[PDB]
Design a protein around this ligand. Structure first.
Ligand SMILES: [La+3]
Ligand SMILES: [La+3]
Ligand SMILES: [La+3]
Lengths: 65, 72
């Protein structure tokens, strides 16, 4: 009702992108875990779909599978 | 060519956002699951951090998200 266990299979390249994003977002004063990067990505995509941005890039990367 | 089982706890609001995004990106000709939306979000935000434009905004949303982890 308040929390949902998300199970997603990812590639090792997406794992590497997760690590690079986690380090890029981090700083000496704030630590960023991979799960926080996932939640932040979900929130950012939700906002962009609220604004309708980068749809050419969203479908470009989705068709890039 | 490895893979990785990923376990992440999310709020019900983000799960609903995941559903809405899954349907919005889907079509009768192509199905987009919630997990595929998660992968697309990962690659999208990683690319955004490589571009170096929206780092301030991502840090703000990140701060507010870390403010929500502590006991709702
Ligand atoms: La809630
Ligand atoms: La490999
Ligand atoms: La691979």
């Amino acid at each position: 009702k308040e929390k949902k266990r998300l199970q997603v299979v990812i590639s090792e390249e997406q794992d590497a992108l997760l690590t690079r994003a986690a380090y890029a977002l981090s700083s000496p004063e704030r630590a960023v875990s991979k799960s926080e990067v996932v939640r932040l990505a979900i929130e950012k995509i939700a906002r962009e779909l609220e604004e309708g941005k980068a749809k050419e890039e969203l479908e470009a990367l989705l068709k890039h599978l």
